[PDB]
Design a protein around this motif. Structure first.
Motif, PDB file in Angstrom:
ATOM      1  N   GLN C 241       0.823  -1.204   0.000  1.00 38.27           N
ATOM      2  CA  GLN C 241       0.000   0.000   0.000  1.00 38.27           C
ATOM      3  C   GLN C 241       0.860   1.259   0.000  1.00 38.27           C
ATOM      4  N   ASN C 287      -8.225  -2.268  -6.748  1.00 37.62           N
ATOM      5  CA  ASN C 287      -7.679  -1.039  -7.312  1.00 37.62           C
ATOM      6  C   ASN C 287      -6.574  -1.342  -8.315  1.00 37.62           C
ATOM      7  N   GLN C 290      -8.141  -2.546 -11.489  1.00 39.37           N
ATOM      8  CA  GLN C 290      -8.662  -1.399 -12.224  1.00 39.37           C
ATOM      9  C   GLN C 290      -7.536  -0.673 -12.950  1.00 39.37           C
ATOM     10  N   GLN C 424     -32.174   2.186  15.014  1.00 37.82           N
ATOM     11  CA  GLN C 424     -32.863   2.773  13.871  1.00 37.82           C
ATOM     12  C   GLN C 424     -33.441   1.689  12.973  1.00 37.82           C
ATOM     13  N   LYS C 425     -32.668   0.633  12.714  1.00 36.16           N
ATOM     14  CA  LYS C 425     -33.175  -0.454  11.886  1.00 36.16           C
ATOM     15  C   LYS C 425     -34.393  -1.108  12.525  1.00 36.16           C
ATOM     16  N   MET C 427     -36.560   0.184  14.704  1.00 36.20           N
ATOM     17  CA  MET C 427     -37.695   1.095  14.764  1.00 36.20           C
ATOM     18  C   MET C 427     -38.063   1.671  13.401  1.00 36.20           C
ATOM     19  N   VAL C 428     -37.433   1.193  12.325  1.00 36.68           N
ATOM     20  CA  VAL C 428     -37.739   1.713  10.993  1.00 36.68           C
ATOM     21  C   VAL C 428     -39.225   1.574  10.687  1.00 36.68           C
ATOM     22  N   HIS C 429     -39.799   0.405  10.957  1.00 33.02           N
ATOM     23  CA  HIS C 429     -41.195   0.132  10.653  1.00 33.02           C
ATOM     24  C   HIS C 429     -41.903  -0.385  11.897  1.00 33.02           C
ATOM     25  N   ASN C 430     -43.200  -0.100  11.979  1.00 32.99           N
ATOM     26  CA  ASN C 430     -44.014  -0.533  13.108  1.00 32.99           C
ATOM     27  C   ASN C 430     -44.153  -2.051  13.124  1.00 32.99           C
TER      28      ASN C 430
END
Ligand SMILES: CCCCCCCCCCCCCCCCCC(=O)OC[C@H](COP(=O)([O-])OCC[N+](C)(C)C)OC(=O)CCCCCCCCCCCCCCCCC
Ligand SMILES: CCCCCCCCCCCCCCCCCCCC(=O)O[C@H](COC(=O)CCCCCCCCCCCCCC)COP(=O)(O)OCCN
Lengths: 56, 98, 430, 49
Positions: C241, C287, C290, C424-425, C427-430
């Motif tokens: 590197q 890399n 590429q 957050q994941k 509580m994302v949806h009910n």
């Protein structure tokens, strides 16, 4: 000094470096070839050793 | 030859523009030190790309989650108000338990 | 500086008649040396060598040992090196001379390595290494151990010192090219010395030589298996590197290919692949792929390394790996912990054993005090919730929501970030 | 860079037209832009700035 002598010396240094790069590539590929030769020879000799040992 | 490198640099610039735009959207200010460090000739591009990918993906996930959770919070508060007022309406004389 | 020293030695020709006058050298040796010096043409040199194969080596050894002057030693070493370079097969003459002397050619120069002239010592070492590589004599015994120790001392010496180290490294590569010398060096402490030299952050030439030595040593499966104790892969990846030299990159990639292909056991192969993945060599390889190079060797090595790394990553992402890690408490940000396909296509398996996996995750999130373990558990819970919404009710019943919320305000920010993401994941949806 | 070899620069007599460079200053920048607006002066001709 940036005279023709200095330019020639720099070009010669560049030539020497490219020669070194080529030489190092050749050394690496030669070592790779030698190891490949050794392993192939060992494989074939083992294959024949199988038959020899079986017979004897 | 180096169009791959220039393309990746342009993508990095786009990432920085997006993060800066979110910065402006928020009240947070942008500092100004005055230093002009040189780009790292070695492959520090990988480290910079990782850093900016984090700073962009985290912000995008944060925005999406904030939007969804705000929607859910508003819906739930509407439900809470509905429940409270329905309880209030069902208070003339609730002699039966159910 | 080695080339400059050789050119200076060749230009500075010192008459060998002084030794003959002083009686410090044999008359026949002096005559042979004079004849060889006068005969510079290939045909004349070959004829003289054929006529006096033993005489040439005997005279060279006698003059070098008796004469304390460095000029004669440098001239003799330069002549020998030039002969070897012009025809590496010339080592047969020295081998025949040693056979006639009924002694190993190593002792005749082993004390010579302690000579005052560093250039003379390096030239003698190079001559010995070339003779060993080209001949049928596999150097061993106390003499071989002393030669290896001298090479190690030269390496520890590490720029004139850098150039001497480079010459020693060339000799070391020549020696290691053979199969037996490889095991000899492996048994010796040479691997640790090379690792320390690399850690010292030497010059570009020294780095290339060390990388080449490592690549050569990796050829033999036994050496590759044994060297795992040194854990070269991390330092090698760091060097790859940091540096950008094409030679260094090619050598490192070839070393990785050799390590991943010559491994004796699939267990060792998986260990090496995991080490590379943890060192984050996959992104560097991508890399490099590429980026475009010229030699097909570099492209082939990059492709092979990428394929092996991907296969190992999939093997790690196998759900059995996740189950074993959960059983053993190995929550250390392994590739499975973030493999998108693994979580997407195996989240249902988390309910196996009557939600035993979920129970283990909850117990870890409750009891574990290690910040890394807690963060890993929180991230795993979040991944499970995201990949399987039906599991939200199961998590709530298990109480994982309360534990995750409590850990959200944990002392360690590393754990806190994962806890926030998981919350957050969830509580994302009910 | 740490490369042992040094990069080398070399002059070479030419035919292509050299550009116009005026070594502008802070005080002379306004006037130099003013005179440049109507066409950048040729190589090494009397500068009206
Ligand atoms: C209280 C009021 C007191 C009175 C003050 C005002 C006095 C009235 C006269 C002022 C005229 C201003 C124009 C001249 C200044 C620009 C020349 C200069 O140095 O710049 C080089 C300008 C602009 O600078 P530039 O961006 O080219 O700088 C060079 C940058 N590089 C090298 C990177 C390209 O360059 C030119 O293009 C040269 C041509 C200039 C020709 C001027 C055209 C008229 C412009 C009118 C200005 C607006 C009218 C006034 C409005 C006032 C209300 C806000
Ligand atoms: C009201 C009645 C009189 C009207 C008629 C006279 C008007 C004269 C107008 C000129 C006076 C103003 C000059 C500019 C003052 C600001 C200085 C700017 C920066 C500066 O020092 O400029 C230098 C150029 O020389 C200069 O700055 C030039 C300074 C010396 C000029 C001398 C000539 C003056 C006029 C004749 C004598 C006086 C006659 C009237 C009594 C070079 O810039 P830098 O190195 O600072 O740049 C720094 C980054 N590169």
């Amino acid at each position: 000094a940036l005279s023709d002598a200095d330019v020639q010396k720099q070009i010669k240094h560049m030539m020497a470096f490219i020669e070194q790069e080529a030489n190092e590539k050749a050394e690496e590929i030669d070592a790779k070839a030698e190891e490949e030769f050794n392993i192939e020879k060992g494989r074939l000799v083992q294959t024949q050793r199988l038959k020899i040992m079986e017979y004897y | 030859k180096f169009v791959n490198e220039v393309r990746r640099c342009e993508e990095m610039d786009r990432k920085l523009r997006f993060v800066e735009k979110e910065i402006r959207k928020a009240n947070i200010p942008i500092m100004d030190t005055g230093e002009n460090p040189e780009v790292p000739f070695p492959r520090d591009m990988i480290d910079l790309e990782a850093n900016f990918e984090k700073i962009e993906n985290e912000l995008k996930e944060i925005n999406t989650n904030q939007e969804a959770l705000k929607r859910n919070f508003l819906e739930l508060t509407e439900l809470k108000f509905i429940l409270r007022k329905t309880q209030q309406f069902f208070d003339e004389m609730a002699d039966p338990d159910l | 500086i080695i080339a400059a020293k050789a050119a200076e030695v060749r230009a500075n020709k010192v008459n060998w008649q002084s030794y003959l006058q002083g009686q410090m050298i044999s008359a026949e040796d002096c005559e042979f040396i004079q004849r060889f010096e006068m005969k510079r043409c290939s045909e004349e040199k070959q004829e003289m060598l054929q006529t006096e194969g033993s005489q040439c080596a005997k005279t060279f050894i006698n003059l070098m040992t008796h004469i304390s002057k460095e000029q004669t030693v440098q001239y003799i070493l330069t002549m020998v090196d030039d002969m070897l370079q012009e025809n590496h097969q010339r080592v047969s003459i020295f081998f025949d001379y040693a056979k006639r002397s009924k002694s190993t050619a190593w002792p005749y120069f082993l004390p010579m390595l302690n000579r005052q002239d560093p250039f003379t010592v390096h030239m003698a070492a190079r001559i010995i290494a070339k003779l060993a590589a080209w001949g049928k004599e596999l150097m061993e015994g106390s003499d071989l151990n002393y030669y290896f120790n001298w090479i190690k001392t030269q390496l520890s010496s590490q720029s004139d010192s850098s150039q001497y180290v480079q010459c020693v490294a060339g000799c070391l590569q020549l020696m290691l090219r053979v199969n037996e010398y490889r095991f000899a060096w492996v048994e010796a402490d040479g691997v640790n010395c090379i690792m320390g030299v690399l850690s010292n952050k030497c010059g570009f030439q020294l780095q290339y030589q060390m990388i080449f030595s490592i690549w050569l040593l990796a050829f033999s499966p036994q050496m590759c298996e044994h060297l795992r104790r040194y854990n070269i892969i991390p330092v090698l990846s760091d060097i790859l590197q940091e540096s950008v030299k094409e030679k260094v990159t090619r050598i490192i990639l070839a070393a990785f290919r050799n390590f991943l292909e010559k491994s004796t056991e699939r267990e060792t192969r998986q260990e090496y692949a995991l080490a590379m993945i943890q060192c984050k060599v996959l992104k560097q390889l991508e890399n490099l792929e590429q980026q475009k190079y010229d030699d097909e060797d570099i492209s082939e090595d990059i492709k092979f390394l990428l394929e092996k790394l991907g296969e190992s990553v999939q093997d790690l992402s196998s759900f059995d790996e996740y189950s074993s890690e959960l059983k053993s408490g190995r929550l250390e940000w392994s590739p499975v912990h973030k493999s998108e396909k693994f979580w997407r296509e195996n989240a249902v398996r988390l309910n196996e054993k009557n939600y035993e996996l979920l129970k283990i995750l909850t117990k870890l999130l409750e009891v574990s005090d290690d910040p890394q373990v807690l963060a890993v558990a929180a991230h795993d819970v979040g991944e499970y919730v995201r990949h399987y919404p039906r599991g939200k009710r199961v998590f709530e019943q298990l109480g994982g929501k309360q534990l995750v919320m409590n850990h959200m305000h944990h002392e360690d920010q590393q754990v806190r970030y994962n806890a926030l993401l998981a919350v957050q994941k969830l509580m994302v949806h009910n | 860079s740490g490369s042992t070899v040094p990069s080398i620069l070399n002059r070479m007599q030419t035919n292509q037209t050299p550009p116009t460079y005026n070594k502008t200053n802070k005080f002379t920048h306004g006037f130099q832009n003013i005179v440049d607006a109507y066409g950048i002066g040729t190589y090494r001709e009397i500068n009206p700035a």
